[PDB]
Amino acid sequence: GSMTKTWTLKKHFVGYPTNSDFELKTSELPPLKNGEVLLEALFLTVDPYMRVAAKRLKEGDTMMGQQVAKVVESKNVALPKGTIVLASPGWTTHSISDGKDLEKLLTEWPDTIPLSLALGTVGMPGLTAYFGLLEICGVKGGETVMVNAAAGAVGSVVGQIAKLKGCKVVGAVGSDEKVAYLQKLGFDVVFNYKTVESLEETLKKASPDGYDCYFDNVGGEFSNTVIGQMKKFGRIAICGAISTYNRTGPLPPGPPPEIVIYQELRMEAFVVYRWQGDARQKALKDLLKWVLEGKIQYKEYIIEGFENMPAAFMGMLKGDNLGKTIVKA
């Protein structure tokens, strides 16, 4: 009896996604069964991983993704109308759930921050920065950390956790606007990797001593240069490689194995969902407390309208976003 809107993949991406690769559909959801609830999207997220996972989708399928939603119709006594939850039905305005696949927000979640932070700094990207930096990289204080995409959802949290842990932070971003923003946040050195005369010279001057840690979101040639300036036994958290997600040809060369061996680098990739239970719960509480204390400032790149969700995904891949990209329903 209820209607919904859903973004589906009409055509597989070639290079960057385009508007014609998506198709909006209006359908009628089935009636609720006993124990089910109807969820209305309040905020939806778009994330770089969707560019990679989309290739395993079939044409006509719904784009994957998480959202903050509220119950608008309930046949479940535990989930009354008004309940806020995180759910991953994909790019859709309304969806059916039985309760098992839903996640309530932290009990201490205050009204002083937008619910949309549950998809960002106090959500999956913030957890990625938390464990990638503190556990994979293992910063203990005083290290020099290189982080790229430093003005995005993950990188901005990485740099600010590093600063509050007593580290020096060198950040790479793709616009002068992002450089200014992170400078205001207090990052030690920030530069626009698109306009540097020499990426090697820039990284050398940013830290003549080398780099203890590298939180890598970009991959590709950029990371080959960073590897040449890691300290011996330096540590790389392989978080992402967004410079390759939209590639049409072969991957770029790897770093010269001469340098990798001499540098005896430890390089570990990770997926945020590895951490669950009490470890995950504790990381969310730390992130919430740091936001409320101002040690982590949040900024959101809000795109208004479900109909503009493809445009938000496409823009984020191209760096339009300063901070977590969010679609307000």
Ligand X SMILES: NC(=O)c1ccc[n+]([C@@H]2O[C@H](COP(=O)([O-])OP(=O)(O)OC[C@H]3O[C@@H](n4cnc5c(N)ncnc54)[C@H](OP(=O)(O)O)[C@@H]3O)[C@@H](O)[C@H]2O)c1
Ligand Y SMILES: COc1ccc2c(c1)c(CC(=O)O)c(C)n2C(=O)c1ccc(Cl)cc1
- Which of 288, 284, 308, 311 lies closest to 298 in space, CA to CA? 288
**Alpha-carbon gap, residue 143 to 65, rounded angstroms:** 35
Residues 239-258 touching ligand Y, rule: CB under 6 A, are 240-241, 245, 257-258
Give the contacts of 317 (CB within 8 A, at least 6 positions apart): 16, 17, 48, 51, 242, 245, 246
171 sits near ligand X (criterion: CB under 6 A): no
**Alpha-carbon gap, residue 7 to 309, rounded angstroms:** 8
300 sits near ligand X (criterion: CB under 6 A): no
Dihedral Cα 128, 279, 82, 31, nearest 10 deg = 80
233 sits near ligand Y (criterion: CB under 6 A): no
48 sits near ligand Y (criterion: CB under 6 A): yes
**Alpha-carbon gap, residue 194 to 120, rounded angstroms:** 26
Task: Please name the residue that has the structure tokens 């990188």.
Answer: 155
Q: Are 135 and 280 in contact (CB under 8 A)?
A: no
16 sits near ligand Y (criterion: CB under 6 A): no
What are 296-300's contacts with CB under 8 Å, separation 24+? 296/121, 296/157, 296/160, 296/161, 296/164, 297/160, 297/185, 298/113, 298/117, 298/120, 298/121, 298/323, 298/324, 299/156, 299/181, 299/323, 299/324, 300/114, 300/116, 300/117, 300/120, 300/324, 300/326
Q: Which does 314 bind (CB under 5 to 8 A by kind): a copy of itself, ligand X, ligand Y, none?
A: a copy of itself
Q: Are 74 and 150 in contact (CB under 8 A)?
A: no
Q: Which stretch binds ligand Y (CB under 6 A): 47-55, 168-176, 201-209, 286-294?
A: 47-55
CA torsion through residues 184, 187, 189, 191, sign: negative
Residues in contact with ligand X, counted by CB under 6 A, come to a total of 31
Rounded to a whole number of angstroms, the minimum distance from the CB of residue 207 to ligand X is 19
133 sits near ligand X (criterion: CB under 6 A): no
Q: Which does 267 bind (CB under 5 to 8 A by kind): ligand Y, ligand X, a copy of itself, none?
A: a copy of itself
53 sits near ligand Y (criterion: CB under 6 A): yes
Among 52, 72, 292, 311, interactor with ligand Y by CB under 6 A: 52
Rounded to a whole number of angstroms, the minimum distance from the CB of residue 162 to a copy of itself is 21
State which residue, 159 or 240, has the beta carbon closest to ligand Y: 240
Rounded to a whole number of angstroms, the minimum distance from the CB of residue 284 to a copy of itself is 21
Among 128, 160, 202, 207, interactor with ligand X by CB under 6 A: 128
Binding mask 10-49 for ligand X (x = CB under 6 A): ----x--------------------------------xxx
Among 149, 265, 309, 329, interactor with ligand X by CB under 6 A: 149
**Alpha-carbon gap, residue 270 to 248, rounded angstroms:** 25
Q: Which stretch binds ligand Y (CB under 6 A): 20-28, 46-54, 74-82, 112-120?
A: 46-54
273 sits near ligand Y (criterion: CB under 6 A): yes
Q: State the maximum Cα–Cα separation within the chain, in Å, rounded to a whole number.
A: 66
Task: Please name the residue that has the structure tokens 């509480």.
Answer: 285
CA 130 distance to own-chain centroid: 12
Residues that bind ligand X (CB under 6 A): 14, 47-49, 125, 128, 149, 151-155, 173-175, 178, 217-218, 239-240, 242-243, 261, 270-272, 316-317, 319, 321, 325
Q: Which residues are annotated as a binding site?
A: 152-155, 178, 193, 217, 239-245, 270-272, 321
Residues that bind ligand Y (CB under 6 A): 47-49, 52-53, 64, 240-241, 245, 257-258, 261-262, 271, 273
Q: Which residues are annotated as a binding site for NADP(+)?
A: 152-155, 178, 193, 217, 239-245, 270-272, 321
